[PDB]
Paper text:
Wnt signalosome assembly relies on reversible head-to-tail polymerization by the N-terminal DIX domain of Dishevelled (Schwarz-Romond et al., 2007), which enables this hub to transduce Wnt signals to cytoplasmic effectors. In addition to DIX, Dishevelled has a PDZ domain (Post-synaptic density protein-95, Disc large tumor suppressor, Zonula occludens-1) and a DEP domain (Dishevelled, Egl-10, and Pleckstrin), separated by long flexible linkers peppered with phosphorylation sites, and also a binding motif for the AP2 clathrin adaptor (Yu et al., 2010). Here, we use structural analysis, as well as biophysical and cell-based assays, to show that the DEP domain of Dishevelled undergoes a conformational switch, from monomeric to swapped dimer, to trigger DIX-dependent polymerization and signaling to β-catenin. This occurs in two steps: binding of monomeric DEP to Frizzled followed by DEP domain swapping triggered by its high local concentration upon Wnt-induced recruitment into clathrin-coated pits.
Purifying lipoyl-tagged DEP (Lip-DEP416–511) by size exclusion chromatography (SEC), we observed two main peaks, corresponding to monomers and dimers (discussed later), in addition to a higher mass species. Thus, we crystallized the monomeric and dimeric fractions and determined three structures at 1.84–2.06 Å resolution. Remarkably, each structure exhibits a swapped dimer, regardless of the crystal form: namely, molecule A (turquoise) donates H1 to the H2–H3 core of molecule B (light turquoise) by extending loop 1, and vice versa. Thus, two DEP cores are connected by an extended β sheet, composed of two antiparallel β strands (each made up by a β1β2 tandem) that interact with each other through backbone atoms of residues 442–447. This dimer-specific interface is based on six new hydrogen bonds, which may bias the equilibrium toward the domain-swapped configuration. Indeed, dimerization does not involve any loss of intramolecular interactions, since β1 and β2 do not interact detectably in the monomer (Wong et al., 2000). Interestingly, the solvent-exposed “underside” of the connecting β sheet presents a hydrophobic patch, made up of a triad of hydrophobic amino acids (M443, L445, and I447) located at the DEP finger tip of the monomer. In each crystal, two DEP dimers associate with each other through this hydrophobic patch, thus linking four DEP cores into a cross-shaped tetramer. The first condition is met by the clathrin-coated pits in which multiple Dishevelled molecules are juxtaposed, potentially reaching a very high local concentration which could be sufficient to induce DEP dimerization. Thus, they mimic the conditions during DEP crystallization, which inexorably induced domain swapping.
Numbering used by the authors:
A (entry chain B), B (entry chain A), C (entry chain A), D (entry chain B): 415 to 509
Amino acid sequence: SGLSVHTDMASVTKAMAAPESGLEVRDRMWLKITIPNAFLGSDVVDWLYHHVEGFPERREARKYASGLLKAGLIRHTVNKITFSEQCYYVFGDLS
Amino acid sequence: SGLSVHTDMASVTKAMAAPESGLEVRDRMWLKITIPNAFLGSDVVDWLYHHVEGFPERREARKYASGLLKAGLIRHTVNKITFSEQCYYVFGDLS
Amino acid sequence: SGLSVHTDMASVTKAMAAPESGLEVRDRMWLKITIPNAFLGSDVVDWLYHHVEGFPERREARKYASGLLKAGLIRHTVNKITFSEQCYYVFGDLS
Amino acid sequence: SGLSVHTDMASVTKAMAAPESGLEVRDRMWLKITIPNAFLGSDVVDWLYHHVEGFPERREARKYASGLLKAGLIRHTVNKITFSEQCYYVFGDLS
């Protein structure tokens, strides 16, 4: 019992920050952003496979989604060249 | 049915964009960022409750954590005011 | 001087990471996200002041904007409470 | 003068949201994230060009930085394969 409510706050925080303190530490985090009308890449692939005739298997639906990205019909919410099923997308200008 | 691999891409996309198309759309996104030594507010509360003497129940370790936030000993990864156990934090300057 | 294209990469990097190396390091990052139809709080205030009759000075159009935020007519792109003219917003549901 | 402080708030907001309302609208936004010890790709290239002997011009310094990324000695804060001078980075595990 070396720390208590009477120890100065700064010292308790440097204790918590030390290697092997026991504090569960992360090198990743997730942030929520409010964006109207965003969608997952996997959901797009699902929609195509179920509603567009002529895909022999789900693989070809992924290739078609990647085509939509290339053409600017859908857009990455943060700019990467590669289509990925875990990233989020929005529609392009469809006017 | 109405759409195939022969339909033009722009029209397939405008069908996917229409109301009631069945595409899962949401007003939010989740973004993964690499940030070394970040931690959940709930993991700060748990650490305090188990390593610092004099909290009669867990509620009191949450109030202490808020106090660390106010003092700048820990910092929100996106400037907010209220301490929340579901958000991610980093250490402030301790030197 | 001490480092060249013949030095091992890991050692060059540890030198760059040392205190007083001269590398510009900061406690913040800026991230660019594609989000259709977003807008600055200052541009909402300006719009209101110029298009809506009965604001004796600009301060009163800022208070009206806060009122839109409270009602959910506009939304913060990252859930905060306070209206700020330097942040970005989107439209809520209006139907 | 068709809108005023006496018009219902919802209607003023749908006015502001209409095409050609005059409201300045964005398809991009910038978010600030607090991350200890982050740095710009361009700053890294500068540091190398000025402190590591054997670069005939700044171009070769960019190629070397891209090598550090590939080797995991520096890391992207959001995961892309390409090194870019406008993105932000953090150090890898240098233990």
